[PDB]
Amino acid sequence: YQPVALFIGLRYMRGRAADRFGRFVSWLSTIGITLGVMALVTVLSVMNGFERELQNNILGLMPQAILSSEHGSLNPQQLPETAVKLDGVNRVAPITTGDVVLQSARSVAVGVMLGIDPAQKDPLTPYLVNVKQTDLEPGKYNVILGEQLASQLGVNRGDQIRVMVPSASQFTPMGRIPSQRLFNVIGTFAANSEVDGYEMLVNIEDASRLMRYPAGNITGWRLWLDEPLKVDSLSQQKLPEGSKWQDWRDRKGELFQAVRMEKNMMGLLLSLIVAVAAFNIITSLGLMVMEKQGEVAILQTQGLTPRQIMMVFMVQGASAGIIGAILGAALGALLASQLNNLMPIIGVLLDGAALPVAIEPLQVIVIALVAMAIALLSTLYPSWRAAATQPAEALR
Amino acid sequence: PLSLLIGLRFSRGRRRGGMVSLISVISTIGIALGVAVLIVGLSAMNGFERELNNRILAVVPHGEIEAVDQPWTNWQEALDHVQKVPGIAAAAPYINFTGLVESGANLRAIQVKGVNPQQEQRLSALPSFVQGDAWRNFKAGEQQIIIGKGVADALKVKQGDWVSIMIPNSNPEHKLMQPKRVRLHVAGILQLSGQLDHSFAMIPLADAQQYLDMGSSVSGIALKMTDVFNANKLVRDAGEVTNSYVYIKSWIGTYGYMYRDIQMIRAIMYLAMVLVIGVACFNIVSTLVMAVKDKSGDIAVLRTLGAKDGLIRAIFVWYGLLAGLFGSLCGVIIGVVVSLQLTPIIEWIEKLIGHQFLSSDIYFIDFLPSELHWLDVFYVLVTALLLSLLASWYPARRASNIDPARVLS
Amino acid sequence: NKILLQCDNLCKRYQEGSVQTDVLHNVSFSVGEGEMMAIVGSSGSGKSTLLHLLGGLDTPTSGDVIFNGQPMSKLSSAAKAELRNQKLGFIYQFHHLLPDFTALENVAMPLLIGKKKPAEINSRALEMLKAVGLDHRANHRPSELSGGERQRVAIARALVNNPRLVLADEPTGNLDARNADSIFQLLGELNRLQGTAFLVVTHDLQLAKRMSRQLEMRDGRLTAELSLM
Amino acid sequence: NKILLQCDNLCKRYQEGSVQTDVLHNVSFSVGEGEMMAIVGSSGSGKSTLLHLLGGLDTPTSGDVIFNGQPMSKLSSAAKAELRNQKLGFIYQFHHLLPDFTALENVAMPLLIGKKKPAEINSRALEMLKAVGLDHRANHRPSELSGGERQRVAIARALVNNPRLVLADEPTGNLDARNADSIFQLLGELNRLQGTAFLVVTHDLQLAKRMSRQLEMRDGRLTAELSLM
């Protein structure tokens, strides 16, 4: 026959059809763990969707990784792109990046300049308006500004702006002179994100000449990742000799770090629910033991080892945990990816887009196993207490 | 007193000590954890509200009106019409520059605000937040500027140091190119918040009009309401009073997300802790089921003395309410203990665990504040009592509907 | 002369199918106020079921307990509650005490359910306490006292409200004679003066002979009804 | 003669000093296989705890119960489990059934504990039902059952796997006589064929005298030792 503990364990949690109430009383623990895991999964899914939106709006439009040389600029001859292949990277493109100061007639701003070759598309080119991508040919100093940046400076097509770099200043008898050049607006870039505020595009050749680099050099290789959330792990990868690694956490790391922190803060703030549910489990057994002590001793008079009775109660506890966790995960998955449908018929707090929802099965699996382990630890103690009790004291 | 004292005796009727008192302390721990964490969260949000009230909305201009075409020829006329508009506490003019501050080979492009000191004292509490300086002696004709501390430390400049300021000063003539580079002397350091101090630099308004070579005019007018939550309509009306050339900007568009996020955080914690108390009241239900199964004989005896069909229900509802009451107090004690020593607790955790919580110019404040509101405590305790009563309600009704003779024979 | 309560043709079956036995048939009582009736019978001879039925604990399958022509069955269970609290006093032969209350609460509990204000109920309890004779140990735990004392405390708490009908199902089985004669005389003056009626069911024949006119309730049938005259 | 079971200086105390009663102290037994020892006495005269000590359920303070050379003290818990599973069968004072388990599985439970395939265990359960005589009531609910049947089902459970030693502490409290004769005939049948030894505790001397060998323990000490042959 199947191991003896399983039969008794499965049979106690069912039965007692004379009232149809004891079933609810015993399943209260499963209900509580189900609500806890449902709340966890739905809130983590919503926050993951919001974070996915942020990463496609902030990181989606900026160099997600940048590989440069140890000293000075990068020479494409030394490290060709076909020789620059790594794990997790799906695309490599030559790039130069810099921080510059932009001077219009009426106001001044700081910006991030991206020197690229016009023949290659960037994820912002679909948002480019009234601008041929190939038009950024070298020597004409064609520059595309963001919509918010252009609005703040208040210039448009056909207006000149002075771009200067103070970090690349050169000493002369008239002091330190920062590099400067006049640039001609050729259109506007409208991506409707924070990046639109400070990102501006120029040709790679003029950009290289601007930072006082020797001709033919580029700053480095921009690398795209399938999952940037693990850049730290990618930072541990072996790199080609003489290179250095840089990444987005230089500028926008803290914010994303903050987001992650906030997540796991809520990650505990709702997790407490299941912890409380765990407590209920113990009390449930605190019921059943005193409701079944006068019977378990008989099983003791049978061949039941104490190590078998510990199992027969722990398996009941684990069965409650398993059923609760699986049912809660199923209800959370059903509620996720569909809350956009149910929300409008009732009051919706947010204005505009209703709600982003991105569900990652890894999170669901992790929280499911966490629920399993917490249920097991909760059900451990009363089982051992019942096992250690000698039959005589239970009887008298 | 009340005839329900019997229940307390059942509360004092605890036998078979050991493994039966464990469930009691488990229930108490659950109630206490839920209630205490709820109170910590609510007090932390109230402290955040207080700090947003003091640190930020008392230094920013609550309303802005800017001329779209030209600096006002009649700025004084517009302002002295608008100061008698009802629902307005004060108004003042200001001029808005943006320029390059350079010192120690470090250059930063920042916006500059030129205001009249005696009026901005009324317009805001900003000079009160200066660490230490001549916040009142700041006047015109001295080539003095005040810089926020973040810009000062990122620029490697200190008090009593000289800086150069470059302004475009565009003119229709050829002088628009090669922006004018004046010299200036820093005088004080501001310490407002994590974000506000990295962009504010203030100059005297008369020296502002002098350094621009512009006329007796300002680039905008700032407004302070008495009530801020309805500033949009008030500023719309105020701009309606003067000419139609104005454009109104209300802080609410920029900063109402902070308020609404605080409200939604409060809602999230409230709902989640309601769920927590719900699970704990399931625990209470289990305890009462055990109590009924163990005192069936005594309740039968109570029945054979001619008690009514609700008296037993009253006994057990009071039993449940008392059981919840014990844990609720045992949690609110900690809840009140924290939220007054909370900041040292959090900095202790911060030193013990080498991880910064809110710093690095993302949250508006650095530390975790707190403020205790007793009405919130009362509301929370009432919520706990109501949930416990709702839980205890069903077992009482079940106990009422058992006939002693039905089971005895 | 019975007017208050009359029992007629009490029938009850309390088993499942197949083994379903109509244990009782044509059970009728003639209990008149002011008269002392005793029920005699042997142990396990089908006497406890109807005796518990006489308290209105379960609904008879057939037969009536009629009050002045007003039937209990048609009126609500709350009516049964005040009948059990104020007009009728019923005693189980088990102790059935409350370990959590002292003697004072254990004896005044029916008065407490009588929702009267503290002074007169407390005085009434003290009066019953002096009549019983256990004033020495008033406020300690009843659990740590002897058997007969607990039984007589149960009897006292049953007789505090001076109910019309006092059904006492062997009050002296676990009691010695030194307290038995005292409680017998006590109930004697209560019966002669206040006039409450007693239906005392007892097993031992000698103590059964101590009552004036005697029924014999055997095997669910009233066979012998012995009267002095 | 006696090989299976040997008791050595049985002593047991389960409380603290001074108040410690020597219910067992230097008590030795001669338990023979194939014979019927019966112990008689009153309630609370050490009839229960003594015989529960025989099952290895508790640890005696002094002395040990040795079965074929294994003292309980050095004997592991699993070995005691197998011993009480395949050699000893015990009946409590009550029925001690499992209200979650129906009669068939309730009586087959040790057989599944015996870890053998369902066919023979179900066949054994059916033949036990034949011997008990309740072919009609095989799968109905113990809750919808009377007392004597459930206690005799408990006895059957205790005897399914053919104990060498069948220990019974007053097995017929709720069981009447016209069933008692039949069940004791069944026990005699198992005695003449299987030869298992029954240790029956009882209060009435009539049934106890018809046992072959009888010890009498009054106030915790064995007074009478009479064996027919």
Numbering used by the authors:
A (entry chain C): 2 to 397
B (entry chain E): 4 to 412
C (entry chain F), D (entry chain D): 2 to 230
List sentences quoted exactly from the publication behind this structure:
Lipoproteins in gram-negative bacteria are sorted to the outer membrane (OM) via the localization of lipoproteins (Lol) export pathway. Among them, LolCDE, an IM-embedded ATP-binding cassette (ABC) transporter initiates lipoprotein sorting by selectively extracting OM-destined lipoproteins from the outer leaflet of the IM and transfers them to LolA, a periplasmic chaperone. Here, we report cryo-EM structures of LolCDE in apo, lipoprotein-bound, and AMPPNP-bound states at a resolution of 3.5 to 4.2 Å. Our studies snapshot 3 functional states of LolCDE in a transport cycle, providing deep insights into the mechanisms that underlie LolCDE-mediated lipoprotein sorting in E. coli.
As the initial LolCDE sample contained predominantly apo-LolCDE particles, we reclassified these particles using a soft mask to exclude densities with bound RcsF. After several rounds of 3D classification and calculation, we finally determined the apo-LolCDE structure at a 4.2-Å resolution using 135,391 selected particles. The overall structure of apo-LolCDE resembles a dumbbell. Strikingly, the TM1s and TM2s of both LolC and LolE are bent outwards creating a V-shaped substrate-binding cavity open to the periplasm. Both PLDs are in elevated position about 20 Å above the plane of membrane, as a result of TM1s and TM2s extending into the periplasm. Moreover, the 2 PLDs interact closely with each other, manifesting a twist of approximately 20° perpendicular to the membrane plane. In our apo-LolCDE structure, the Cα-Cα distance between Ala106 in PLDLolC and Ser173 in PLDLolE is only 5.4 Å, whereas the distance is increased to 48.6 Å in apo-LolCDE*. Taken together, we conclude that our apo-LolCDE structure represents the correct apo conformational state of LolCDE, which resembles closely the conformation of RcsF-LolCDE. First, apo-LolCDE embedded in the inner membrane adopts an outward-facing conformation. The open conformation of apo-LolCDE allows lipoprotein entry into the substrate cavity via the LoopLolC-TM2LolE interface (i.e., the Interface I) in an ATP-independent manner.
